[PDB]
Write an enzyme that holds these catalytic residues in place. Structure first.
Site, mmCIF file in Angstrom:
data_model
loop_
_atom_site.group_PDB
_atom_site.id
_atom_site.type_symbol
_atom_site.label_atom_id
_atom_site.label_comp_id
_atom_site.label_asym_id
_atom_site.label_seq_id
_atom_site.Cartn_x
_atom_site.Cartn_y
_atom_site.Cartn_z
ATOM 1 N N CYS A 216 0.879 -1.199 0.000
ATOM 2 C CA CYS A 216 0.000 0.000 0.000
ATOM 3 C C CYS A 216 0.903 1.231 0.000
ATOM 4 O O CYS A 216 1.952 1.172 0.646
ATOM 5 C CB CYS A 216 -0.869 -0.035 1.256
ATOM 6 S SG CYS A 216 -1.911 1.442 1.537
ATOM 7 N N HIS B 56 4.917 5.511 2.591
ATOM 8 C CA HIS B 56 4.988 6.713 3.447
ATOM 9 C C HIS B 56 5.848 6.434 4.706
ATOM 10 O O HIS B 56 6.464 7.361 5.245
ATOM 11 C CB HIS B 56 3.588 7.187 3.808
ATOM 12 C CG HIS B 56 2.767 7.775 2.705
ATOM 13 N ND1 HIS B 56 3.272 8.146 1.455
ATOM 14 C CD2 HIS B 56 1.451 8.113 2.693
ATOM 15 C CE1 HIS B 56 2.296 8.689 0.725
ATOM 16 N NE2 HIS B 56 1.161 8.652 1.458
ATOM 17 N N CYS C 35 -7.054 -3.312 3.439
ATOM 18 C CA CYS C 35 -6.860 -1.866 3.377
ATOM 19 C C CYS C 35 -7.466 -1.255 2.111
ATOM 20 O O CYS C 35 -8.560 -0.591 2.245
ATOM 21 C CB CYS C 35 -5.393 -1.487 3.485
ATOM 22 S SG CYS C 35 -5.262 0.331 3.483
ATOM 23 N N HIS D 189 0.329 -3.797 6.492
ATOM 24 C CA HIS D 189 -0.950 -3.722 7.213
ATOM 25 C C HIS D 189 -2.089 -4.303 6.399
ATOM 26 O O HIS D 189 -3.181 -4.370 6.937
ATOM 27 C CB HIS D 189 -1.174 -2.257 7.583
ATOM 28 C CG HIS D 189 -1.283 -1.367 6.398
ATOM 29 N ND1 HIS D 189 -0.176 -0.916 5.722
ATOM 30 C CD2 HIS D 189 -2.363 -0.862 5.794
ATOM 31 C CE1 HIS D 189 -0.588 -0.176 4.720
ATOM 32 N NE2 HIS D 189 -1.930 -0.088 4.766
ATOM 33 N N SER E 111 0.697 3.705 1.879
ATOM 34 C CA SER E 111 0.973 4.070 3.292
ATOM 35 C C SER E 111 2.225 3.343 3.789
ATOM 36 O O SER E 111 2.943 3.942 4.609
ATOM 37 C CB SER E 111 -0.188 3.765 4.207
ATOM 38 O OG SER E 111 -1.364 4.445 3.795
#
Ligand SMILES: NC(=O)C1=CN([C@@H]2O[C@H](COP(=O)(O)OP(=O)(O)OC[C@H]3O[C@@H](n4cnc5c(N)ncnc54)[C@H](O)[C@@H]3O)[C@@H](O)[C@H]2O)C=CC1
Ligand SMILES: NC(=O)C1=CN([C@@H]2O[C@H](COP(=O)(O)OP(=O)(O)OC[C@H]3O[C@@H](n4cnc5c(N)ncnc54)[C@H](O)[C@@H]3O)[C@@H](O)[C@H]2O)C=CC1
Ligand SMILES: OCc1ccc(Br)cc1
Ligand SMILES: OCc1ccc(Br)cc1
Ligand SMILES: [Zn+2]
Ligand SMILES: [Zn+2]
Ligand SMILES: [Zn+2]
Ligand SMILES: [Zn+2]
Lengths: 374, 374
Positions: free
Chosen positions: B46, B51, B174, B67, B48
């Site tokens: 993902c 990030h 997610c 996640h 994220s």
């Protein structure tokens, strides 16, 4: 008998920002097609009219301000169908044309014919019905109620109950309806919720009335002027807080009071810092914050978008989200039926020619609504 | 055969910002009371997770990130009631404790037990189940899926269908659920509406699927990478615009294309500027804009509150507004009944060991979702 003729009357002209209103002899043209000329009976002094004086709210000058009013129709232009001479009316500072995408949308009320987004200070036809010693005077939000007579577009006037008390229901033209609607229509406050209301003037008091009517269990008023608390409590505030009393930020105070954030917050002041504080004090996952205050011209706020990513909802509205022409008559009928009270908003009643005393009272903190009578 | 024992297994450790993952041996402690040890089957990459590498999303390092995953319960701690060994499960980066004021609220999903607001990178008890080179390693959002085995709190795992294909349904952990929910739950997109979706990665394509499932008439995909357009059109975008092709700012283009603004806009990138642009392009009186993109740590955006005062609604959400433990098994049941598609989001499948090639595919613009298999 004044129908089809120029009326010479007194109006309060604002020639320059940060100056007193000037009572002037103006000429008011007769209404052209789809226009209504109104004899004013009562107008309320709203903080937004003061914003014009302070330069917070930019609109072309010189201007006849005033937007919260009620009068009687003196005459109608060709083609008018929704009002007649003798009718009691409230001018609508947010019009309802009934034909644009917003007027056709179930929720929206900010009609595309509004003079708020990019103020011109004219009639819909781009001209003025007001002259002062040969000089054209701008209109304000298509209403201009600080005059003995005004001319409005038919989309900017609603007929109301022939028995309504104009010295009270003028508040339905702005401050009551904005504040009450912000609670009941825009926020949709729920039974048993916790509400925080920033700003306890006429519009914030009407927010409190709205929250109480919607069954809020807790309504926390916030004002730096503790003199406002007694009246906030009378109309339903369970608690009041003065940020100046605390050695830490009021959003932290309201978060601790509300056991992790309020359900609904309202900014009813017009300051960038309180808009961000009101958002921050609503619960991070499911809180809703409504901006009602008119911000200072051209200024941007600064905020952390994580306040929204957690789940908060942030919205604003004009005139409490009410479709103006449809709602204003129903709100008057509800008033006539004792569904809500307007006397708690009215602290002073002055004749029109004492308008500057009316604004001095607002600026001093001593008034909520001053009603100017004709 | 591993129950009650320390597991030695491979994990992708992030030691430092802006460095490759290090695939190395870790020690995974057995689960304590109300904890669940999971054998990972598949995990998505993902944005994220990226990030965390770039320092855009701050969480304690060193860390096992990831996640968005699915696996099989290896063992349970004392008192676990909601899963058993051999159950298929999806770890929940947003927990559902069921006990807190948010979990009990009908709209709220951002459980107060989350590790997103103020990240600690631990289990609920404030300790880690991971050792590497004899050091403790942080968890990520109570999930840590870039490991052959992880330990999660019971409130951070959902039991799913015993027959689900884990190499697809990891996306319900997610990117799919977040996009889809942002449209159907958070925005509550209406039949016949016009939607604008900024960013056409896995989450933006998921937002489009939700917009199509809600019966949107028009869905305008927006992305500076025109290579994203084809897949966006396949999953329901009616038009795609690249801001780089226009002289005018894209909020001006979308406002024109929508005859005065869209009903619903979505920021699915994570930039301050696109969050304001997406808010601006929704219709000023009744538009709704949903922030989905994760903004850079501690940075404020600047905006004009007149965008909200006209009547716009601004909100954001985590995980598409879904109560995670209630929702994820239902989303898997709906997937098994082909109520939505996940294959359109999966562009690459690689073995876990090739995680860094995974991140390179994302960073280059080439992939939507890469699924890592264990
Ligand atoms: N959205 C809309 O359609 C409408 C907007 N408004 C706006 O609503 C706002 C309120 O109007 P009124 O109630 O007539 O004004 P008002 O001035 O009577 O009330 C404002 C209150 O805010 C308080 N205040 C000032 N600074 C404060 C601070 N830093 N922290 C806490 N309290 C503070 C004052 O003590 C005062 O009681 C104004 O900005 C006005 O322009 C009014 C009507 C329509
Ligand atoms: N709110 C939540 O619960 C969740 C948030 N996220 C976030 O959602 C965002 C998207 O995640 P993915 O789809 O996985 O990422 P992604 O990186 O695959 O897609 C983002 C897309 O935006 C495009 N883009 C970049 N700059 C742009 C610009 N200036 N204008 C238009 N498009 C631009 C890229 O070309 C790319 O196609 C990320 O910030 C991620 O962290 C993801 C999942 C859960
Ligand atoms: O109170 C009248 C008024 C409301 C909103 C704006 Br914006 C300007 C004036
Ligand atoms: O994509 C997982 C995730 C979602 C929202 C935030 Br904030 C951080 C990470
Ligand atoms: Zn209209
Ligand atoms: Zn007003
Ligand atoms: Zn919870
Ligand atoms: Zn994610």
């Amino acid at each position: 008998s004044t129908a089809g003729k120029v009326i010479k009357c007194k109006a309060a002209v604002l020639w320059e920002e940060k100056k007193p209103f000037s009572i002037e002899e103006v000429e008011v043209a007769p209404p052209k097609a789809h226009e209504v000329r109104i004899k004013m009976v009562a107008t309320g002094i709203c903080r937004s009219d003061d914003h014009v004086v302070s330069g917070t709210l930019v609109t072309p000058l010189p201007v006849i301000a005033g937007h919260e009013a009620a009068g009687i129709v003196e005459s109608i232009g060709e083609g008018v169908t929704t009002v007649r001479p003798g009718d009691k009316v409230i001018p609508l500072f947010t019009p309802q044309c009934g034909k644009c995408r917003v007027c056709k949308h179930p929720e929206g009320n900010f009609c595309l014919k509004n003079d708020l987004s990019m103020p011109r200070g004219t009639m819909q036809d781009g001209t003025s019905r007001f002259t002062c010693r040969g000089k054209p005077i701008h209109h304000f939000l298509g209403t201009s109620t600080f005059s003995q007579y005004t001319v409005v577009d038919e989309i900017s006037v609603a007929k109301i109950d022939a028995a309504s008390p104009l010295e009270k229901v003028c508040l339905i033209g702005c401050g009551f309806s904005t504040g009450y609607g912000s609670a009941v229509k825009v926020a949709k406050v729920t039974q048993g919720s916790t509400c925080a209301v920033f700003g306890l003037g006429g519009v914030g008091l009407s927010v409190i009335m709205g929250c109480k009517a919607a069954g809020a269990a807790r309504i926390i008023g916030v004002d730096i002027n503790k003199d406002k608390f007694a009246k906030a409590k009378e109309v339903g505030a369970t608690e009041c807080v003065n940020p100046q009393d605390y050695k830490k930020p009021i959003q932290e105070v309201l978060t601790e009071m509300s056991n992790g954030g309020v359900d609904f917050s309202f900014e009813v002041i017009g300051r960038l810092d309180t808009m961000v504080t009101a958002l921050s004090c609503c619960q991070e996952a499911y809180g809703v914050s409504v901006i009602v205050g008119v911000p200072p011209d051209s200024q941007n706020l600064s905020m952390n978008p994580m306040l929204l990513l957690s789940g908060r909802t942030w919205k604003g509205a004009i005139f409490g989200g009410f479709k103006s022409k449809d709602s204003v008559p129903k709100l008057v009928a509800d008033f006539m039926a004792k569904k809500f009270a307007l006397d708690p908003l009215i602290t002073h009643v002055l004749p029109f020619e004492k308008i500057n005393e009316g604004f001095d009272l607002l600026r001093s903190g001593e008034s909520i609504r001053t009603i100017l009578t004709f």
